[PDB]
mmCIF file of C-alpha atoms in Angstrom:
data_model
loop_
_atom_site.group_PDB
_atom_site.id
_atom_site.type_symbol
_atom_site.label_atom_id
_atom_site.label_comp_id
_atom_site.label_asym_id
_atom_site.label_seq_id
_atom_site.Cartn_x
_atom_site.Cartn_y
_atom_site.Cartn_z
ATOM 1 C CA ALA Z 255 -25.286 -1.681 28.843
ATOM 2 C CA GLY Z 256 -23.253 -4.185 27.477
ATOM 3 C CA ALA Z 257 -26.412 -6.524 26.313
ATOM 4 C CA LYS Z 258 -28.330 -3.040 25.032
ATOM 5 C CA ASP Z 259 -25.677 -0.744 24.056
ATOM 6 C CA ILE Z 260 -22.013 -1.949 23.780
ATOM 7 C CA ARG Z 261 -23.138 -4.583 20.478
ATOM 8 C CA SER Z 262 -24.607 -0.765 18.549
ATOM 9 C CA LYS Z 263 -21.024 0.703 19.525
ATOM 10 C CA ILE Z 264 -19.294 -2.168 17.889
ATOM 11 C CA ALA Z 265 -21.455 -1.917 14.782
ATOM 12 C CA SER Z 266 -21.140 2.384 14.806
ATOM 13 C CA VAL Z 267 -17.297 1.608 14.635
ATOM 14 C CA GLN Z 268 -17.311 -0.871 12.347
ATOM 15 C CA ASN Z 269 -18.883 1.903 10.367
ATOM 16 C CA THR Z 270 -17.096 4.158 10.647
ATOM 17 C CA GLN Z 271 -13.965 1.850 9.864
ATOM 18 C CA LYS Z 272 -15.441 0.463 6.590
ATOM 19 C CA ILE Z 273 -16.125 4.305 5.520
ATOM 20 C CA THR Z 274 -12.747 5.067 6.426
ATOM 21 C CA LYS Z 275 -11.076 3.049 4.125
ATOM 22 C CA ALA Z 276 -12.725 3.622 1.446
ATOM 23 C CA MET Z 277 -11.446 7.844 1.951
ATOM 24 C CA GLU Z 278 -8.457 5.777 1.913
ATOM 25 C CA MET Z 279 -8.787 4.296 -2.036
ATOM 26 C CA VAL Z 280 -10.181 7.958 -2.896
ATOM 27 C CA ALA Z 281 -7.900 9.976 -1.799
ATOM 28 C CA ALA Z 282 -5.670 7.853 -3.327
ATOM 29 C CA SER Z 283 -6.857 8.054 -6.482
ATOM 30 C CA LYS Z 284 -7.118 12.303 -6.271
ATOM 31 C CA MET Z 285 -3.112 12.006 -5.532
ATOM 32 C CA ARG Z 286 -3.126 10.080 -9.126
ATOM 33 C CA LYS Z 287 -5.033 13.048 -10.929
ATOM 34 C CA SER Z 288 -3.145 15.918 -8.753
ATOM 35 C CA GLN Z 289 0.457 14.228 -9.699
ATOM 36 C CA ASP Z 290 -0.892 14.446 -13.165
ATOM 37 C CA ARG Z 291 -1.814 18.003 -13.254
ATOM 38 C CA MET Z 292 1.519 18.436 -11.490
ATOM 39 C CA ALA Z 293 3.392 16.886 -14.471
ATOM 40 C CA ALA Z 294 1.237 18.740 -16.871
ATOM 41 C CA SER Z 295 2.498 22.216 -15.327
ATOM 42 C CA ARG Z 296 6.364 21.911 -15.526
ATOM 43 C CA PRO Z 297 7.226 22.674 -18.817
ATOM 44 C CA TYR Z 298 5.206 26.292 -19.551
ATOM 45 C CA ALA Z 299 7.192 27.433 -16.526
ATOM 46 C CA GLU Z 300 10.320 25.845 -17.677
ATOM 47 C CA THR Z 301 10.235 27.356 -21.441
ATOM 48 C CA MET Z 302 9.874 30.925 -19.503
ATOM 49 C CA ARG Z 303 12.312 30.628 -17.554
ATOM 50 C CA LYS Z 304 14.601 29.762 -20.672
ATOM 51 C CA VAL Z 305 12.957 32.709 -22.363
ATOM 52 C CA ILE Z 306 13.798 34.940 -19.287
ATOM 53 C CA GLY Z 307 17.145 33.580 -18.858
ATOM 54 C CA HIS Z 308 18.010 34.740 -22.092
ATOM 55 C CA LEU Z 309 16.363 37.660 -21.916
ATOM 56 C CA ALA Z 310 18.705 38.786 -18.705
ATOM 57 C CA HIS Z 311 22.058 36.785 -19.495
ATOM 58 C CA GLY Z 312 22.267 38.059 -23.097
ATOM 59 C CA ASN Z 313 24.984 40.306 -24.595
ATOM 60 C CA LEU Z 314 23.311 43.449 -23.931
ATOM 61 C CA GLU Z 315 22.147 43.148 -20.258
ATOM 62 C CA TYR Z 316 18.878 44.480 -19.215
ATOM 63 C CA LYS Z 317 17.534 45.563 -14.940
ATOM 64 C CA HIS Z 318 14.393 45.714 -13.783
ATOM 65 C CA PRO Z 319 13.102 45.745 -10.549
ATOM 66 C CA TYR Z 320 11.648 42.580 -10.507
ATOM 67 C CA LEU Z 321 14.990 41.130 -11.533
ATOM 68 C CA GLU Z 322 17.478 44.022 -9.309
ATOM 69 C CA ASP Z 323 18.880 43.208 -5.853
ATOM 70 C CA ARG Z 324 17.320 45.530 -3.356
ATOM 71 C CA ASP Z 325 17.879 46.426 0.111
ATOM 72 C CA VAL Z 326 15.409 44.292 2.707
ATOM 73 C CA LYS Z 327 13.484 47.049 4.448
ATOM 74 C CA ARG Z 328 10.011 44.745 4.185
ATOM 75 C CA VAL Z 329 9.714 41.255 4.053
ATOM 76 C CA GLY Z 330 6.395 39.261 2.990
ATOM 77 C CA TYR Z 331 4.985 35.906 2.108
ATOM 78 C CA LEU Z 332 1.995 34.539 0.765
ATOM 79 C CA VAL Z 333 1.001 30.456 2.093
ATOM 80 C CA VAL Z 334 -1.175 27.852 0.552
ATOM 81 C CA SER Z 335 -3.135 25.725 2.949
ATOM 82 C CA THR Z 336 -5.912 23.486 2.737
ATOM 83 C CA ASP Z 337 -9.640 23.487 2.934
ATOM 84 C CA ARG Z 338 -10.898 20.669 4.761
ATOM 85 C CA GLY Z 339 -9.427 19.174 7.548
ATOM 86 C CA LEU Z 340 -7.996 15.906 8.076
ATOM 87 C CA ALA Z 341 -4.801 15.412 6.517
ATOM 88 C CA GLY Z 342 -2.488 15.033 9.322
ATOM 89 C CA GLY Z 343 -0.069 17.622 10.440
ATOM 90 C CA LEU Z 344 0.773 19.246 7.197
ATOM 91 C CA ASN Z 345 -0.617 22.702 7.339
ATOM 92 C CA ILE Z 346 0.330 22.926 11.459
ATOM 93 C CA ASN Z 347 4.265 22.183 10.068
ATOM 94 C CA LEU Z 348 3.818 24.600 7.285
ATOM 95 C CA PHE Z 349 2.404 27.377 9.867
ATOM 96 C CA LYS Z 350 5.086 26.602 11.902
ATOM 97 C CA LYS Z 351 8.211 26.941 10.232
ATOM 98 C CA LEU Z 352 6.268 29.734 8.729
ATOM 99 C CA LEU Z 353 6.607 31.595 11.869
ATOM 100 C CA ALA Z 354 9.643 30.469 12.790
ATOM 101 C CA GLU Z 355 11.122 32.276 10.058
ATOM 102 C CA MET Z 356 8.543 35.158 10.507
ATOM 103 C CA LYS Z 357 9.702 35.642 13.935
ATOM 104 C CA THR Z 358 13.525 35.495 12.447
ATOM 105 C CA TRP Z 359 13.009 38.548 10.901
ATOM 106 C CA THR Z 360 10.959 40.326 13.000
ATOM 107 C CA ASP Z 361 14.377 40.015 15.511
ATOM 108 C CA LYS Z 362 16.132 42.002 12.424
ATOM 109 C CA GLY Z 363 13.257 44.568 12.856
ATOM 110 C CA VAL Z 364 11.635 44.004 9.691
ATOM 111 C CA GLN Z 365 7.867 44.520 9.404
ATOM 112 C CA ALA Z 366 6.267 41.282 7.518
ATOM 113 C CA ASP Z 367 2.966 40.530 5.919
ATOM 114 C CA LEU Z 368 1.019 37.508 4.577
ATOM 115 C CA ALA Z 369 -1.212 36.694 1.725
ATOM 116 C CA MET Z 370 -3.257 33.991 1.671
ATOM 117 C CA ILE Z 371 -4.636 30.875 0.142
ATOM 118 C CA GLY Z 372 -7.093 28.655 2.185
ATOM 119 C CA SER Z 373 -8.793 28.851 4.890
ATOM 120 C CA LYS Z 374 -7.066 26.862 7.271
ATOM 121 C CA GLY Z 375 -4.140 29.634 7.248
ATOM 122 C CA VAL Z 376 -6.843 32.423 7.228
ATOM 123 C CA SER Z 377 -8.082 30.846 10.716
ATOM 124 C CA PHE Z 378 -4.950 29.852 11.924
ATOM 125 C CA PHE Z 379 -2.836 33.399 11.087
ATOM 126 C CA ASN Z 380 -6.222 35.472 12.599
ATOM 127 C CA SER Z 381 -5.695 33.548 16.035
ATOM 128 C CA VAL Z 382 -1.984 34.536 15.925
ATOM 129 C CA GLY Z 383 -2.671 37.835 14.486
ATOM 130 C CA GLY Z 384 -0.124 38.856 11.518
ATOM 131 C CA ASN Z 385 -1.054 41.374 9.440
ATOM 132 C CA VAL Z 386 -3.476 38.856 6.568
ATOM 133 C CA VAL Z 387 -3.369 41.241 3.761
ATOM 134 C CA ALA Z 388 -4.974 38.838 1.229
ATOM 135 C CA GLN Z 389 -7.568 36.019 1.238
ATOM 136 C CA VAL Z 390 -8.744 33.536 -1.951
ATOM 137 C CA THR Z 391 -10.393 30.411 -0.897
ATOM 138 C CA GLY Z 392 -13.020 27.510 -1.959
ATOM 139 C CA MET Z 393 -11.284 25.781 -4.605
ATOM 140 C CA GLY Z 394 -10.970 22.850 -4.085
ATOM 141 C CA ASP Z 395 -9.964 20.107 -6.433
ATOM 142 C CA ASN Z 396 -9.051 21.772 -9.722
ATOM 143 C CA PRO Z 397 -7.720 25.339 -8.916
ATOM 144 C CA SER Z 398 -7.949 27.729 -11.163
ATOM 145 C CA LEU Z 399 -5.085 30.185 -11.711
ATOM 146 C CA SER Z 400 -7.741 32.848 -12.645
ATOM 147 C CA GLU Z 401 -8.300 32.792 -9.171
ATOM 148 C CA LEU Z 402 -4.828 33.171 -8.182
ATOM 149 C CA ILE Z 403 -4.042 36.190 -10.575
ATOM 150 C CA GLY Z 404 -5.883 38.773 -7.673
ATOM 151 C CA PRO Z 405 -3.666 38.129 -4.276
ATOM 152 C CA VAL Z 406 -0.356 38.032 -6.884
ATOM 153 C CA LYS Z 407 -0.974 40.986 -8.281
ATOM 154 C CA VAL Z 408 -1.659 42.840 -5.524
ATOM 155 C CA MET Z 409 1.787 41.175 -3.496
ATOM 156 C CA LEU Z 410 3.047 42.602 -7.328
ATOM 157 C CA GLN Z 411 2.034 46.284 -6.877
ATOM 158 C CA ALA Z 412 2.489 45.671 -2.501
ATOM 159 C CA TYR Z 413 6.566 44.996 -4.211
ATOM 160 C CA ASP Z 414 7.681 47.372 -6.801
ATOM 161 C CA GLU Z 415 6.355 50.903 -4.909
ATOM 162 C CA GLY Z 416 9.019 50.283 -1.732
ATOM 163 C CA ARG Z 417 6.231 48.468 -0.113
ATOM 164 C CA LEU Z 418 8.215 44.935 -0.312
ATOM 165 C CA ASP Z 419 11.652 44.872 -0.808
ATOM 166 C CA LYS Z 420 11.345 40.566 -1.099
ATOM 167 C CA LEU Z 421 8.629 37.714 -1.443
ATOM 168 C CA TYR Z 422 8.757 33.744 -0.697
ATOM 169 C CA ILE Z 423 6.369 31.138 -1.382
ATOM 170 C CA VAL Z 424 5.275 29.377 1.164
ATOM 171 C CA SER Z 425 4.278 25.355 0.502
ATOM 172 C CA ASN Z 426 4.606 21.671 0.687
ATOM 173 C CA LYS Z 427 6.240 19.740 -2.207
ATOM 174 C CA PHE Z 428 5.025 16.450 -3.119
ATOM 175 C CA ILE Z 429 8.256 14.496 -3.567
ATOM 176 C CA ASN Z 430 7.092 11.680 -3.477
ATOM 177 C CA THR Z 431 3.680 9.603 -2.829
ATOM 178 C CA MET Z 432 5.595 8.922 1.049
ATOM 179 C CA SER Z 433 6.815 11.997 1.489
ATOM 180 C CA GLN Z 434 6.344 15.471 1.593
ATOM 181 C CA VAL Z 435 8.212 18.381 2.874
ATOM 182 C CA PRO Z 436 7.187 22.101 3.638
ATOM 183 C CA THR Z 437 9.018 24.470 2.290
ATOM 184 C CA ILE Z 438 10.188 27.555 1.446
ATOM 185 C CA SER Z 439 11.276 29.775 -1.698
ATOM 186 C CA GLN Z 440 11.685 33.484 -2.764
ATOM 187 C CA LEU Z 441 10.230 34.787 -5.673
ATOM 188 C CA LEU Z 442 10.537 38.410 -5.485
ATOM 189 C CA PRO Z 443 13.609 39.370 -6.640
ATOM 190 C CA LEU Z 444 14.531 36.836 -8.988
ATOM 191 C CA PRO Z 445 17.273 34.532 -7.262
ATOM 192 C CA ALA Z 446 17.189 32.259 -10.050
ATOM 193 C CA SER Z 447 21.469 31.651 -10.911
ATOM 194 C CA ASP Z 448 22.422 33.019 -14.204
ATOM 195 C CA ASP Z 449 23.253 31.231 -17.181
ATOM 196 C CA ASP Z 450 25.203 31.525 -19.876
ATOM 197 C CA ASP Z 451 24.540 31.157 -23.970
ATOM 198 C CA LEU Z 452 25.528 31.658 -27.646
ATOM 199 C CA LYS Z 453 22.801 30.491 -30.035
ATOM 200 C CA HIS Z 454 20.355 32.843 -28.258
ATOM 201 C CA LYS Z 455 21.028 36.630 -28.219
ATOM 202 C CA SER Z 456 23.268 36.510 -31.560
ATOM 203 C CA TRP Z 457 20.332 34.887 -33.326
ATOM 204 C CA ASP Z 458 18.201 37.462 -31.193
ATOM 205 C CA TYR Z 459 14.566 37.784 -31.473
ATOM 206 C CA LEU Z 460 12.918 40.548 -33.269
ATOM 207 C CA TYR Z 461 10.950 42.666 -30.355
ATOM 208 C CA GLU Z 462 7.807 43.816 -31.161
ATOM 209 C CA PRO Z 463 6.725 46.606 -30.355
ATOM 210 C CA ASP Z 464 9.861 46.597 -28.037
ATOM 211 C CA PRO Z 465 12.116 44.470 -25.622
ATOM 212 C CA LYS Z 466 11.409 45.940 -22.181
ATOM 213 C CA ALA Z 467 7.822 45.894 -21.991
ATOM 214 C CA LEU Z 468 7.501 41.842 -22.937
ATOM 215 C CA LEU Z 469 10.385 41.471 -20.155
ATOM 216 C CA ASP Z 470 7.818 42.582 -17.717
ATOM 217 C CA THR Z 471 4.914 40.702 -18.822
ATOM 218 C CA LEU Z 472 7.481 38.232 -19.333
ATOM 219 C CA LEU Z 473 7.895 38.488 -15.576
ATOM 220 C CA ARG Z 474 4.792 38.486 -14.269
ATOM 221 C CA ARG Z 475 3.688 35.868 -16.084
ATOM 222 C CA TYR Z 476 6.251 33.667 -14.632
ATOM 223 C CA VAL Z 477 5.222 34.632 -10.911
ATOM 224 C CA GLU Z 478 2.067 33.752 -11.446
ATOM 225 C CA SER Z 479 2.695 30.509 -13.243
ATOM 226 C CA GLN Z 480 5.065 29.916 -10.283
ATOM 227 C CA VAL Z 481 2.773 30.716 -7.720
ATOM 228 C CA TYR Z 482 0.211 28.185 -9.568
ATOM 229 C CA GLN Z 483 2.257 25.673 -9.723
ATOM 230 C CA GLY Z 484 2.970 25.994 -6.070
ATOM 231 C CA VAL Z 485 -0.686 25.730 -5.573
ATOM 232 C CA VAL Z 486 -0.778 22.421 -7.207
ATOM 233 C CA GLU Z 487 1.548 20.624 -5.443
ATOM 234 C CA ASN Z 488 0.363 21.433 -1.996
ATOM 235 C CA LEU Z 489 -2.753 20.194 -3.573
ATOM 236 C CA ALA Z 490 -0.991 16.618 -4.288
ATOM 237 C CA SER Z 491 1.239 17.021 -1.101
ATOM 238 C CA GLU Z 492 -2.497 17.025 0.778
ATOM 239 C CA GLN Z 493 -4.129 14.332 -0.663
ATOM 240 C CA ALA Z 494 -1.211 12.027 0.203
ATOM 241 C CA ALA Z 495 -1.572 13.395 3.603
ATOM 242 C CA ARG Z 496 -4.808 12.103 3.714
ATOM 243 C CA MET Z 497 -4.432 8.818 2.367
ATOM 244 C CA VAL Z 498 -2.033 8.337 5.471
ATOM 245 C CA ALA Z 499 -4.461 9.654 7.677
ATOM 246 C CA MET Z 500 -7.009 8.028 6.859
ATOM 247 C CA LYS Z 501 -5.006 4.721 7.140
ATOM 248 C CA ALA Z 502 -3.946 5.316 10.240
ATOM 249 C CA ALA Z 503 -7.922 5.977 11.204
ATOM 250 C CA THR Z 504 -9.022 2.677 9.642
ATOM 251 C CA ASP Z 505 -6.113 0.881 11.926
ATOM 252 C CA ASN Z 506 -7.113 2.567 15.187
ATOM 253 C CA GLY Z 507 -10.540 1.430 14.232
ATOM 254 C CA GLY Z 508 -9.679 -2.330 14.140
ATOM 255 C CA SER Z 509 -7.600 -2.163 16.968
ATOM 256 C CA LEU Z 510 -10.664 -0.528 19.469
ATOM 257 C CA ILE Z 511 -12.945 -3.462 17.794
ATOM 258 C CA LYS Z 512 -11.569 -6.001 19.366
ATOM 259 C CA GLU Z 513 -10.757 -5.008 22.975
ATOM 260 C CA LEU Z 514 -14.632 -4.014 22.776
ATOM 261 C CA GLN Z 515 -15.318 -7.532 21.464
ATOM 262 C CA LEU Z 516 -13.676 -8.662 24.608
ATOM 263 C CA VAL Z 517 -15.324 -6.355 27.170
ATOM 264 C CA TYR Z 518 -18.533 -7.535 25.778
ATOM 265 C CA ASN Z 519 -18.311 -11.660 25.238
ATOM 266 C CA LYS Z 520 -16.788 -11.455 29.673
ATOM 267 C CA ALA Z 521 -19.980 -9.385 30.288
ATOM 268 C CA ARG Z 522 -22.392 -11.865 28.101
ATOM 269 C CA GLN Z 523 -20.515 -14.973 29.970
ATOM 270 C CA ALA Z 524 -21.102 -12.784 33.371
ATOM 271 C CA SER Z 525 -25.141 -12.435 33.032
ATOM 272 C CA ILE Z 526 -25.818 -15.605 31.998
ATOM 273 C CA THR Z 527 -23.587 -16.817 34.723
ATOM 274 C CA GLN Z 528 -25.616 -14.670 37.182
ATOM 275 C CA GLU Z 529 -28.622 -15.511 36.077
ATOM 276 C CA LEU Z 530 -28.438 -18.625 36.470
ATOM 277 C CA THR Z 531 -26.878 -18.752 39.782
ATOM 278 C CA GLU Z 532 -30.416 -16.739 40.501
ATOM 279 C CA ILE Z 533 -33.089 -19.206 38.849
ATOM 280 C CA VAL Z 534 -30.979 -22.109 40.790
ATOM 281 C CA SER Z 535 -30.818 -20.515 44.589
ATOM 282 C CA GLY Z 536 -34.731 -19.433 43.369
ATOM 283 C CA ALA Z 537 -35.567 -23.033 44.065
ATOM 284 C CA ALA Z 538 -34.936 -23.501 46.793
ATOM 285 C CA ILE N 49 8.672 -27.072 42.357
ATOM 286 C CA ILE N 50 6.799 -26.037 39.353
ATOM 287 C CA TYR N 51 2.462 -26.530 39.389
ATOM 288 C CA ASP N 52 1.137 -26.866 36.296
ATOM 289 C CA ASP N 53 -1.624 -25.157 35.559
ATOM 290 C CA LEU N 54 -3.076 -24.447 38.803
ATOM 291 C CA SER N 55 -6.079 -22.646 37.211
ATOM 292 C CA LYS N 56 -6.564 -26.667 36.128
ATOM 293 C CA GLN N 57 -6.656 -27.121 39.707
ATOM 294 C CA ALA N 58 -9.388 -24.502 40.647
ATOM 295 C CA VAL N 59 -11.909 -25.718 37.756
ATOM 296 C CA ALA N 60 -11.096 -29.325 40.124
ATOM 297 C CA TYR N 61 -12.645 -27.816 42.843
ATOM 298 C CA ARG N 62 -15.491 -26.633 41.401
ATOM 299 C CA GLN N 63 -16.680 -29.547 40.170
ATOM 300 C CA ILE N 64 -15.928 -31.057 43.337
ATOM 301 C CA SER N 65 -17.539 -28.366 45.307
ATOM 302 C CA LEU N 66 -20.682 -28.148 42.610
ATOM 303 C CA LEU N 67 -21.236 -31.765 43.434
ATOM 304 C CA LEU N 68 -21.278 -30.725 46.838
ATOM 305 C CA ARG N 69 -24.090 -28.680 46.181
ATOM 306 C CA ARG N 70 -21.807 -25.632 47.576
ATOM 307 C CA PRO N 71 -23.316 -21.938 46.280
ATOM 308 C CA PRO N 72 -20.651 -20.774 44.110
ATOM 309 C CA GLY N 73 -19.681 -16.738 43.907
ATOM 310 C CA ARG N 74 -17.969 -14.824 41.001
ATOM 311 C CA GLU N 75 -17.793 -17.111 37.965
ATOM 312 C CA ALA N 76 -18.654 -20.336 39.597
ATOM 313 C CA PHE N 77 -16.147 -20.736 41.367
ATOM 314 C CA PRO N 78 -16.458 -21.228 45.712
ATOM 315 C CA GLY N 79 -16.139 -18.378 48.137
ATOM 316 C CA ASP N 80 -13.282 -20.727 49.369
ATOM 317 C CA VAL N 81 -10.995 -20.552 45.824
ATOM 318 C CA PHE N 82 -8.787 -18.218 47.212
ATOM 319 C CA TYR N 83 -8.155 -19.953 50.554
ATOM 320 C CA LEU N 84 -7.280 -23.025 48.682
ATOM 321 C CA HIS N 85 -4.197 -21.559 46.543
ATOM 322 C CA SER N 86 -3.176 -19.404 49.453
ATOM 323 C CA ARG N 87 -2.722 -22.375 51.931
ATOM 324 C CA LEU N 88 -0.873 -24.200 48.726
ATOM 325 C CA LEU N 89 0.873 -21.096 48.194
ATOM 326 C CA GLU N 90 2.071 -20.415 51.482
ATOM 327 C CA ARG N 91 4.279 -23.476 52.078
ATOM 328 C CA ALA N 92 6.523 -22.071 49.811
ATOM 329 C CA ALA N 93 9.730 -20.089 52.495
ATOM 330 C CA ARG N 94 12.778 -19.569 53.527
ATOM 331 C CA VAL N 95 13.153 -20.347 57.735
ATOM 332 C CA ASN N 96 15.777 -19.802 59.632
ATOM 333 C CA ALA N 97 18.232 -22.108 60.856
ATOM 334 C CA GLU N 98 16.368 -21.770 64.822
ATOM 335 C CA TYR N 99 13.528 -23.895 62.993
ATOM 336 C CA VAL N 100 15.648 -26.501 61.237
ATOM 337 C CA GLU N 101 17.186 -26.669 64.695
ATOM 338 C CA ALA N 102 13.783 -27.474 66.522
ATOM 339 C CA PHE N 103 12.667 -29.742 63.347
ATOM 340 C CA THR N 104 15.541 -31.716 63.489
ATOM 341 C CA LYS N 105 15.722 -32.068 66.693
ATOM 342 C CA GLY N 106 19.518 -30.890 67.161
ATOM 343 C CA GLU N 107 20.802 -33.014 63.881
ATOM 344 C CA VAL N 108 21.450 -30.097 61.500
ATOM 345 C CA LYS N 109 22.408 -26.511 62.949
ATOM 346 C CA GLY N 110 22.701 -23.414 61.145
ATOM 347 C CA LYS N 111 21.117 -24.370 57.600
ATOM 348 C CA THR N 112 18.600 -22.222 56.359
ATOM 349 C CA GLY N 113 15.763 -24.713 54.749
ATOM 350 C CA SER N 114 13.914 -22.899 51.913
ATOM 351 C CA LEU N 115 11.278 -23.931 48.842
ATOM 352 C CA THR N 116 11.035 -21.791 45.845
ATOM 353 C CA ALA N 117 7.887 -22.228 43.917
ATOM 354 C CA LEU N 118 6.716 -21.335 40.463
ATOM 355 C CA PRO N 119 2.924 -21.689 39.904
ATOM 356 C CA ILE N 120 1.214 -21.462 36.317
ATOM 357 C CA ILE N 121 -1.910 -19.556 35.579
ATOM 358 C CA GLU N 122 -3.436 -19.591 31.878
ATOM 359 C CA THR N 123 -5.630 -16.238 30.609
ATOM 360 C CA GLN N 124 -7.688 -16.190 28.255
ATOM 361 C CA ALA N 125 -7.262 -13.471 25.461
ATOM 362 C CA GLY N 126 -4.601 -12.457 27.809
ATOM 363 C CA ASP N 127 -7.079 -11.443 29.648
ATOM 364 C CA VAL N 128 -5.173 -10.115 33.652
ATOM 365 C CA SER N 129 -7.936 -8.807 35.338
ATOM 366 C CA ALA N 130 -10.029 -12.571 35.509
ATOM 367 C CA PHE N 131 -11.640 -13.916 38.872
ATOM 368 C CA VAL N 132 -8.472 -16.838 39.601
ATOM 369 C CA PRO N 133 -5.522 -14.570 37.602
#
């Protein structure tokens, strides 16, 4: 009913378009806040990396299970995912890259299992039927490391007891506002390239109680910081993807409105012409 | 031959037609509107040599005549689905 309902449909599409236009700006501001958090996160991680490098590559070289190379018999991943929809194809791209690597490791006969952050990954990998050992959901904005302590603790327990031989973090990277990339990077064993120094380990740190327990705690805190930083960066990438998707949705609504208006105008003219032909014919 | 605004012709038949009280059809054009263009356009054709010889009374032989036509039609809002287009 062009005279009755199409006029209502046009208004509904207009309202939806305005709502998406607002959502784009909301996402753009949340992206800036997430960028500030992400930039704040780095120096703690880089300082702890400097300390672990000094302890590992000092004149006296220690050996630790989290540090030494071990042959591969089981491979593990932990994956971050969004808890809200929209955000384009970010989650699906990340999941299919993870599935490609998981299939590559399966072909070598290596058993794999997953730790999960975010409900989208939980649902997708339950549909796939991959082994999920741990899950955490519902961070929303302002995610906390305190929640993260769990899954990393259980993945560490699996790794050091021999159940796991290598560990990867799967997340998207905020290259910039316009571009994001899904990436996978190793956590255990410590992949970082060696470094050399003289000042350190010459004017060596006094160790209390002993250098080894401090190294264990330091490595655990380092991997925890790595996964927290990955989570924050993935959140920022989610916000950027949502901004882009909302721009596209607003443009689509704006394109639909004009075609609906053209159809409505054609119907409007046709109705007037038909009814006036009827009126004139009725005056026999 | 390049007729310009064959649309502006169709509006003119409607006026001569509505002034003659003839019942309008879809939109406001009379049903004869198709016959109007069909009989004008159908004259553009290529004729075999025998027709030319018959018409010329044997003066011209072995040549085929032709008449190309490029009608122009104007659409509102790019609507190719209108009646006259």
